[PDB]
């Protein structure tokens, strides 16, 4: 014991937890999926190294366990990452970012019409991949776009 370097953190308490998130992409997942509409430990931190070429973000909640699929509906944003639900004091569930059939309430049929705008409804699309990008079909307007165009205003 007694080498040379400093730290303050490590693997803490229970709850579902997150591994690997690009930069400036961290905060996103929070506001976007309403990750504070509660009272549980939602402690986190951004821009800290954990194994990558420059940056990486991680998350930490307890008492709340992700839907063994909701996981999916979360994918896309953090290309590659992990969950690893923490049921009772230690590791207990390795998951990975796989594409959902759909993704609701988070996007916007970038079609100035595509009805859902002044209307009280959840924006539902449709995931589809190929090569140069990812496509999704406006559930309401039936107009398809690439995840890029949809990801912006």
């Amino acid at each position: 014991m007694t080498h040379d370097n400093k730290l303050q953190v490590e693997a803490i308490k229970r709850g579902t937890v997150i591994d690997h998130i690009p930069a400036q992409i961290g905060f996103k997942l929070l506001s976007l999926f309403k990750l504070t509409e509660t009272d549980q430990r939602i402690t986190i931190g951004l821009n800290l190294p954990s194994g990558e070429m420059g940056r990486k973000d991680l998350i930490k909640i307890e008492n709340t366990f992700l839907s063994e699929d909701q996981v999916d509906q979360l994918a896309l944003y953090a290309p590659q990452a992990t969950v690893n639900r923490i049921d009772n004091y230690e590791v207990v569930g390795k998951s990975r970012p796989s594409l959902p059939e759909r993704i609701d309430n988070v996007l916007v049929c970038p079609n100035s019409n595509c009805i859902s705008h002044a209307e009280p409804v959840s924006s539902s699309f449709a995931v589809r991949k190929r090569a140069n990008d990812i496509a999704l079909k406006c559930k309401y307007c039936e107009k398809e776009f690439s995840h890029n165009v949809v990801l912006a205003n």
């Binding site: 009805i115 307007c141 398809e144």
Partner: protein, 310 residues
């Protein structure tokens, strides 16, 4: 009971082949033996948030030929003075409680679908939600092709006009691609050609198709000639003009068409089809119209009658 009872009619895309054949089957049967009291005691909202009289009348006539009563509106440009004083959803919710069915047309895409999630068990039939669907048109197109060609399989179809912004088309071509055989011909200018996604979808089901510059090429080999109106505003006076009276169809051009061949148009026309055609025997664009009465009439029966068998 029947496959399509109490069900919505939104996008042509989501209709099985059995689905289609059913409606058509009904159509030609309802045409054959007119049942003016089937829908006695039903009330149906003819809601036109986006005015289309031509359409309203057609639909509304089927609502009548079946003993059903109708009430609605055609909230046009002097009715649509309100952009924020009643959400569609709320309107659908309210209106959903008076009637037995809702035939609605809308300026915006997604409307019919939306209304669905706010109409309880009351059925909604999309008469054209923006630039998206309008299943009602596609079906009468079809119905018209089949009855004139005896089949909807293994056919040569021509599609002329503004292929790029013509939904009616996209819709029809998709439907057709639901049958075997069939070779397509799209003769539309370069800036209004058929869209890629359509081509690809035909690439996928391995469907025969080629492009042309003028109908004259293919004219000899087509069973169906589908004319669509181009618009000056989709280009510019010179541009348009410099090609308008180019993809027009006139009587002289049918000298090598098949007896069975028929000319079609979702209407209204203006240029695409010279008046002198209206007399040849290939002109079925009007029969095509009156047929929308048995497509739309048939649809309401199926959706509103628990079990139908002539």
């Amino acid at each position: 009971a029947n496959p399509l009872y109490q069900k919505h009619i939104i996008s042509i895309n989501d209709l099985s082949r059995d689905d289609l054949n059913l409606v058509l089957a009904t159509a030609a049967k309802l045409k054959a033996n007119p049942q003016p009291e089937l829908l006695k005691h039903k009330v149906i909202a003819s809601c036109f948030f986006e005015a289309s009289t031509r359409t309203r009348l057609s639909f509304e006539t089927s609502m009548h030929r079946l003993g059903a009563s109708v009430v609605g509106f055609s909230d046009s440009a002097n009715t649509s003075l309100g952009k924020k004083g009643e959400t569609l959803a709320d309107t659908i919710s309210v209106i959903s409680t008076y009637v037995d069915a809702i035939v609605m047309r809308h300026p915006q895409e997604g409307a019919a679908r939306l209304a669905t999630e706010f109409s309880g068990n009351v059925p909604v039939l999309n008469a054209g939600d923006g630039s998206n669907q309008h299943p009602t048109q596609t079906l009468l197109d079809l119905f018209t092709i089949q009855e004139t060609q005896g089949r909807l399989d293994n056919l040569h179809v021509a599609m002329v006009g503004d292929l790029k912004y013509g939904r009616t088309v996209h819709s029809l071509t998709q439907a057709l691609a639901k049958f075997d055989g069939n070779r397509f011909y799209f003769i539309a200018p370069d800036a209004l050609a058929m869209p890629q996604y359509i081509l690809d979808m035909l690439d996928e089901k391995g469907i025969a198709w080629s492009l042309h510059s003028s109908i004259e090429e293919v004219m000899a080999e087509v069973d169906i000639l589908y004319m669509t109106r181009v618009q000056k505003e989709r280009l510019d006076p010179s541009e348009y003009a410099n090609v308008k009276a180019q993809f027009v169809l006139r009587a002289s051009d049918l000298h090598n068409a098949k007896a069975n061949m028929k000319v079609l148009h979702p209407l209204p026309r203006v240029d695409e089809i010279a008046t002198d055609v209206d007399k040849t025997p290939h002109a079925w664009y009007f029969q095509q119209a009156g047929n929308g009465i048995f497509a739309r009439q048939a649809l309401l029966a199926l959706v509103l009658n628990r079990d139908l068998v002539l």
